[PDB]
Design an enzyme around this catalytic site. Structure first.
Site, PDB file in Angstrom:
ATOM      1  N   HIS A 227       0.849  -1.173   0.000  1.00 35.81           N
ATOM      2  CA  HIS A 227       0.000   0.000   0.000  1.00 35.81           C
ATOM      3  C   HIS A 227       0.905   1.251   0.000  1.00 35.81           C
ATOM      4  O   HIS A 227       0.756   2.149  -0.841  1.00 35.81           O
ATOM      5  CB  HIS A 227      -0.890  -0.020   1.244  1.00 35.81           C
ATOM      6  CG  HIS A 227      -1.730   1.206   1.403  1.00 35.81           C
ATOM      7  ND1 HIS A 227      -2.988   1.323   0.851  1.00 35.81           N
ATOM      8  CD2 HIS A 227      -1.478   2.383   2.020  1.00 35.81           C
ATOM      9  CE1 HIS A 227      -3.475   2.520   1.124  1.00 35.81           C
ATOM     10  NE2 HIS A 227      -2.578   3.182   1.832  1.00 35.81           N
ATOM     11  N   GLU A 228       1.847   1.297   0.941  1.00 35.31           N
ATOM     12  CA  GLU A 228       2.779   2.412   1.029  1.00 35.31           C
ATOM     13  C   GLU A 228       3.647   2.546  -0.230  1.00 35.31           C
ATOM     14  O   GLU A 228       3.943   3.662  -0.671  1.00 35.31           O
ATOM     15  CB  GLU A 228       3.672   2.256   2.261  1.00 35.31           C
ATOM     16  CG  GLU A 228       2.937   2.360   3.600  1.00 35.31           C
ATOM     17  CD  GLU A 228       1.962   3.527   3.652  1.00 35.31           C
ATOM     18  OE1 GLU A 228       2.288   4.616   3.130  1.00 35.31           O
ATOM     19  OE2 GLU A 228       0.864   3.356   4.220  1.00 35.31           O
ATOM     20  N   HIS A 231       1.829   4.502  -2.795  1.00 32.07           N
ATOM     21  CA  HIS A 231       1.924   5.931  -2.548  1.00 32.07           C
ATOM     22  C   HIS A 231       3.321   6.349  -3.034  1.00 32.07           C
ATOM     23  O   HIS A 231       3.466   7.300  -3.811  1.00 32.07           O
ATOM     24  CB  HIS A 231       1.785   6.247  -1.060  1.00 32.07           C
ATOM     25  CG  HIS A 231       0.372   6.291  -0.576  1.00 32.07           C
ATOM     26  ND1 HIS A 231      -0.619   6.990  -1.234  1.00 32.07           N
ATOM     27  CD2 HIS A 231      -0.216   5.743   0.514  1.00 32.07           C
ATOM     28  CE1 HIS A 231      -1.755   6.869  -0.571  1.00 32.07           C
ATOM     29  NE2 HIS A 231      -1.538   6.116   0.492  1.00 32.07           N
ATOM     30  N   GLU A 266      -5.804   8.779  -1.379  1.00 27.68           N
ATOM     31  CA  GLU A 266      -6.033   7.574  -0.602  1.00 27.68           C
ATOM     32  C   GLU A 266      -7.023   6.647  -1.309  1.00 27.68           C
ATOM     33  O   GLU A 266      -6.787   5.438  -1.415  1.00 27.68           O
ATOM     34  CB  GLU A 266      -6.577   7.961   0.767  1.00 27.68           C
ATOM     35  CG  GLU A 266      -6.349   6.937   1.838  1.00 27.68           C
ATOM     36  CD  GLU A 266      -4.884   6.569   1.998  1.00 27.68           C
ATOM     37  OE1 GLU A 266      -4.498   5.480   1.534  1.00 27.68           O
ATOM     38  OE2 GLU A 266      -4.119   7.368   2.576  1.00 27.68           O
TER      39      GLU A 266
HETATM   40 ZN   LIG Z   1      -2.537   5.368   2.392  1.00 23.19          ZN
END
Ligand SMILES: [Zn+2]
Ligand SMILES: [Cl-]
Ligand SMILES: [Cl-]
EC number: 3.4.24.69
Lengths: 436, 423
Positions: A227-228, A231, A266
């Site tokens: 997930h990170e 980003h 997000e």
């Molecule tokens: Zn996030």
């Protein structure tokens, strides 16, 4: 247990002597002056710092619970965590195992490759005919003899700050430029821990798994990290959505959350339904915007006559960015942005790399929405192969944890999860509902 | 309101509800079609297949090198990216309601799994008052049996029947075709979360059949589709090709328009409606678990009241009991999820999509007159084929374009719900 010596081809032990190449004390962009921290280079452009993050942010040096809690569903504190060599060694091995697991999937292989090529743009010159690196996209690697040399990198994984389970992407900026939103990109620092994970509740697999366990299930650390990394991917390509763009919620009614505010970036990162909460008018707004940013980079590359600060030729550096942004060039050497190629690259970074698609490749149980808030925090140890594998995560094949995500079940696989005290009270943030 | 019964509801257990501001569109925006109108190709959906194609056209070898750069200052001066400041959300806000809420009913089904071993199931929300009294939406007969003190000689039989009783209560399901798009109905949902404020399986099933899925929503979402922008056409006297291209673009452009309206409605439905159903299915799962825990609590307490006879005479294994009740919860959820999937899609198809389709039909009507007039006024330029074109226009603008959820959503469990719906 395969795919071990693959993305990270080094069997690092935390106490191994420094060498100034892949094992060294380093210094990173900082306000005042920081003391060197022992770091490891697990792959080209990627480092790991087994230390609690008490240096990226000057206002974040204390590792104790803040005065005001932290309007989050779950939080955990322990100033003692990540302070011993053993802890740091296990952290290094944990982060590494997660990388191998991510790398062992096709999507993971793609995202990791996109990250390594996502070199922050050399746009630090005030003289447009010169390509210069931006110093905050580098670190200083201290040598054994006490001397040092600077090096560029795209990603750094560091321990968490005070709130041990608050994971995020942090990067330094320029005085006037917005590196994460202008296509330039910037080195990313990720606060993360492979030593804890979240607990969430399932309300839906069943239908397909009638024997699904009872309690709470643990999020797979690999998903959290991926997930990170998504980003990180956005930020490295300077296309992350401005944090100001957030999904405003109504809160007046008694049944509504008192507050939330989840950013577009997000929703984009999670994928699934969440990302579709964004109408097309705004999605096209974002794409057009970043497409124009990419054209600017293209112009800047064409304006460059010389490169400063390196023995690397101007040609090499231009090619490096031709490849990263997938630009086209004529026989004359002119660079331009191909709408089709831009679109694919943009779709891949934005819609292909998503938490949800990763869940698909990993085939584990996971929240189906960003809105399914965690309800618990557990302590775990994914390093021993008998607890977690690069291929199966917690759900070990040819084991009673193989089916129905039993491995991810807190009660069933209780020897792998210890429930820790949440530091955000059940009633810290709430609404008082009264009836006459 | 002098006296009050209050409960603290965790912020994170509350409903989402997006601001109408997040949803924008330029559907009412007009447009002029020309022989050069850019036609947007079909945006292929994300799938394991697309990801496959991307993987193949991917370069893994030769990463950028670790080229040497000249030493920077021994201290690199930097400052992290700003990061917007979010005002702390208001807390502890009090509310006085004229009804028991979903949250009260749910809270009423709780008890502290501590020492206080004297829990007793009951059918009134006054279990909210007494911490030893847990509320249940189960039949009154169930409360009588579970609360009853049971002989050590009848323990196991007692339990076995409760497991069955438990499954009977939760496996409850109703059928019908008097609601359209919703064939099954789980009647105990009504009295479990007090949906619609009625707390009577009986009233519940009725309310649902009367007004549909809207009954479940904590708030009726808003969704409007303005009058769609119309098309203007450019004629090219004596230029057949350009004239034809204009007519094909006007047409292909109408298809995009239907897609645009459909996609917009799906975004709204997905954010405002589907989210509410999702929380409701999460709460049903909570309620069910509360019940299993209360029953286990009561049953285990009984067992501890015995005296060493628990040894052979019984040899109880609360884990097996817990295991069986869990399977029942899963069976129950399978039904609930099916029912909720139907409610969700039903609301999309009957209370939302319709609004766009009417707007789109008005549009098709306009475009049709326009194009047929166009063809007529240029019958000289198009001499070689007016009928071919007239037929094309008439055939295309006379049929609405089919709404296909898979075209906008990927959740396979929602797509099948749609397929089943189609029949
Ligand atoms: Zn996030
Ligand atoms: Cl392994
Ligand atoms: Cl261990």
């Amino acid at each position: 247990e395969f795919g071990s010596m693959e993305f990270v081809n080094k069997q690092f032990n935390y106490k191994d002597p420094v060498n100034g190449v892949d094992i060294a004390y380093i210094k990173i962009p900082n306000a005042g002056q920081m003391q060197p921290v022992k770091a490891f280079k697990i792959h080209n452009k990627i480092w790991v710092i087994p230390e609690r993050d008490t240096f990226t942010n000057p206002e974040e040096g204390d590792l104790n619970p803040p005065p005001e809690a932290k309007q989050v569903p779950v939080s955990y504190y322990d100033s003692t965590y990540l302070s011993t060599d053993n802890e740091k060694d296990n952290y290094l091995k944990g982060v590494t195992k997660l990388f191998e697991r991510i790398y062992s999937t096709d999507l993971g292989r793609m995202l990791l490759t996109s990250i390594v090529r996502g070199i922050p743009f050399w746009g630090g010159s005030t003289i447009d005919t010169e390509l210069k690196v931006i110093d905050t996209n580098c670190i200083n690697v201290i040598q054994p003899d006490g001397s040092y040399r600077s090096e560029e990198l795209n990603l750094v994984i560091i321990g968490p700050s005070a709130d041990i389970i608050q994971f995020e992407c942090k990067s330094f900026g320029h005085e006037v430029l917005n590196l994460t939103r202008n296509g330039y990109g910037s080195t990313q620092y990720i606060r993360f821990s492979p030593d804890f994970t979240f607990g969430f509740e399932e309300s839906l697999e069943v239908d397909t798994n009638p024997l699904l366990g009872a309690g709470k299930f643990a999020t797979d650390p690999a998903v959290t990290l991926a997930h990170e990394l998504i980003h990180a991917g956005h930020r490295l390509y300077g296309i992350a959505i401005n944090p100001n763009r957030v999904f405003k919620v109504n809160t007046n009614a008694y049944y509504e959350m008192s507050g939330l505010e989840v950013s577009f970036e997000e929703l984009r990162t999670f994928g699934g339904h969440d990302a579709k909460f964004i109408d097309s008018l705004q999605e096209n707004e974002f794409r057009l915007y970043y497409y124009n940013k990419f054209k600017d980079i293209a112009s800047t590359l064409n304006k460059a006559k010389s490169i400063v600060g390196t023995t690397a030729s101007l040609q090499y550096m231009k090619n490096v960015f031709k490849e990263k942004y997938l630009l086209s060039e004529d026989t004359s050497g002119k660079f331009s942005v191909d709408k089709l190629k831009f679109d694919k690259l943009y779709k891949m970074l934005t819609e292909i790399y998503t938490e949800d698609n990763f869940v698909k490749f990993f085939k584990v149980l996971n929240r189906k929405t960003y809105l399914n808030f965690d309800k618990a925090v557990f302590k775990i140890n994914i390093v021993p192969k008998v607890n977690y594998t690069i291929y199966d995560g917690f759900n070990l094949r040819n084991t009673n944890l193989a089916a129905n995500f039993n491995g991810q079940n807190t009660e069933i696989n209780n020897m792998n999860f210890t429930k820790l005290k949440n530091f955000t009270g059940l009633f810290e943030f709430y609404k008082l509902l009264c009836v006459d | 309101a002098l006296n009050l019964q209050c409960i603290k509801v965790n912020n994170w257990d509350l409903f989402f509800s997006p601001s109408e501001d997040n949803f924008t569109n330029d559907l009412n925006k007009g447009e002029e079609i020309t022989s050069d109108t850019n036609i947007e190709a079909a945006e292929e959906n994300i799938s394991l297949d697309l990801i496959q194609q991307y993987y193949l056209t991917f370069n893994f070898d030769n990463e950028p090198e670790n080229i040497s750069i000249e030493n920077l200052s021994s201290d690199i001066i930097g400052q992290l990216e700003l990061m917007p400041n979010i005002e702390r959300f208001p807390n502890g806000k009090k509310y006085e309601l004229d009804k028991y809420t979903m949250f009260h009913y749910l809270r009423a089904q709780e008890f502290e799994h501590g020492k206080s071993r004297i829990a007793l199931t009951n059918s009134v929300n006054e279990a909210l008052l007494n911490p030893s009294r847990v509320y249940t939406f189960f039949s009154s007969d169930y409360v009588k049996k579970v609360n009853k003190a049971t002989e050590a000689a009848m323990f196991l039989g007692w339990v076995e029947q409760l497991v069955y009783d438990f499954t009977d209560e939760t496996s409850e399901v109703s059928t019908t075709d008097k609601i359209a798009d919703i064939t099954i109905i789980i009647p105990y949902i009504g009295p479990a979360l007090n949906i619609g404020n009625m707390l009577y399986k009986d009233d519940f099933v009725g309310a649902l059949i009367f007004s549909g899925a809207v009954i479940l929503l904590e708030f009726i979402p808003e969704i409007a589709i303005p009058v769609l922008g119309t098309f203007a056409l450019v004629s090219y006297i004596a230029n057949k090709v350009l004239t034809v291209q204009t007519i094909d673009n006007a047409l292909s452009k109408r298809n995009e328009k239907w897609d645009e309206v459909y996609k917009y409605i799906v975004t709204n439905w997905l954010a405002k409606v589907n989210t509410q159903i999702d929380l409701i299915r999460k709460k049903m799962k909570e309620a069910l678990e509360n019940q299993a825990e209360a029953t286990k609590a009561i049953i285990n307490y009984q067992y501890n009241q015995y005296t060493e006879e628990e040894k052979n005479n019984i040899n109880f294994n609360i884990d097996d009991l817990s295991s069986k009740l869990n399977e029942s919860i899963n069976k129950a959820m399978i039904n609930i999820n099916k029912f909720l999937n139907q409610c969700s899609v039903s609301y999309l198809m009957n209370s939302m999509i319709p609004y766009g389709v009417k707007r789109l039909e008005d549009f098709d009507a306009s475009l049709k007159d326009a194009l047929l007039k166009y063809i007529y006024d240029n019958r000289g330029t198009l001499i070689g084929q007016v009928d071919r074109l007239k037929d094309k226009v008439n055939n295309t603008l006379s049929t609405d374009i089919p709404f296909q959820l898979s075209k906008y959503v990927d959740n396979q469990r929602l797509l099948s719900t749609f397929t089943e719906y189609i029949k």
